[PDB]
Amino acid sequence: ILKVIILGDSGVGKTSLMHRYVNDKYSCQYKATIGADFLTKEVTVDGDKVATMQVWDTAGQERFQSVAFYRGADCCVLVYDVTNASSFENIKSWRDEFLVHANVNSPETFPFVILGNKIDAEESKKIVSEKSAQELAKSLGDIPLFLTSAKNAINVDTAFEEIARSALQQNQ
Ligand SMILES: *CCC(=O)NCCCNc1nc(=O)c2ncn([C@@H]3O[C@H](COP(=O)(O)OP(=O)(O)NP(=O)(O)O)[C@@H](O)[C@H]3O)c2[nH]1
Ligand SMILES: [Cl-]
Ligand SMILES: [Mg+2]
């Protein structure tokens, strides 16, 4: 039933976030994602309505990418790394890439969620203000925002409850 797509630059932590939420596990070892594929999780909404969530991981590197999979999606998650300025500045282009290729019926209502990942990292290395993120998140149509750590299992549960809630609303 529920199709969710996760987009964002290489290295931001998409695959890690998916393993955290679906499998409650994490691994330090970078293994580059190639082509799109999904894992599944049975969910229960805040309402105690039940659903199977199909979570799609995608490649961040141009050369490992795929097009069709974007269609169907009931929610789109946009992920940047709080330690990498460029990843953040690319969020709107990931959003627009999705809308161009996704063939969704109402772009101004279609649910996106943004995640800022790697908050567990040392302050010295962190670059993207919460404030900036909240600005970008509003300017893109008041999209929900969540700061997360796949590594330390921080807030990934919260983030994905909204992603679930927003996706079920869009499906039917
Ligand atoms: C354990 C060694 C250590 O201390 N490393 C530094 C800790 C940095 N913290 C941290 N926090 C996170 O929440 C987190 N998520 C993911 N990473 C790391 O970044 C690399 C990329 O992970 P992927 O999940 O492979 O990223 P991606 O899917 O977007 N890449 P693709 O688009 O597929 O190329 C990886 O090293 C992961 O461990 C985090 N690090
Ligand atoms: Cl524009
Ligand atoms: Mg990956």
Author numbering: 8 to 73, 76 to 181
Q: What's written in the study?
A:
Extending the labelling experiments to other GTPases, placing a cysteine at the position equivalent to E35 in Rab1b led to covalent interaction with aGTP for all those tested (Rab5A, Rab6A, Rab7A, Rab8A, Ypt7, HRas and Cdc42), albeit at variable rates, but substitution of cysteine at positions corresponding to L125 in Rab1b only led to covalent reaction in the case of Rab7A. Using this Ypt7 variant, we were able to produce a covalently linked aGTP adduct that was stable enough to allow crystallization within 12 h at 4 °C and allowed structure determination. In addition to this, we were able to determine the structure of the covalent adduct of the Ypt7Q35C mutant with aGppNHp (for data collection and refinement statistics for Ypt7Q35C–aGDP, Ypt7Q35C–aGppNHp, and Ypt7Q35C, K38I, Q68L–aGTP see Table 1). Structural comparison of these adducts with Ypt7:GDP and Ypt7:GppNHp demonstrates that the covalent linker provides sufficient flexibility to allow the covalently locked proteins to adopt similar conformations of the nucleotide-binding pocket and in particular of the switch I region of Ypt7Q35C–aGDP, Ypt7Q35C–aGppNHp and Ypt7Q35C,K38I,Q68L–aGTP compared with the non-covalently nucleotide-bound proteins. Despite this flexibility, the electron density around the nucleotide and the linker was well defined in Ypt7Q35C–aGDP and Ypt7Q35C,K38I,Q68L–aGTP, whereas in Ypt7Q35C–aGppNHp this was only true for two (chains A and B) out of four copies within the asymmetric unit. In conclusion, the structures of Ypt7 modified with aGDP, aGTP or aGppNHp are very similar to the non-covalent Ypt7:nucleotide complexes, demonstrating that the structural properties of GTPases are maintained in covalently modified proteins.
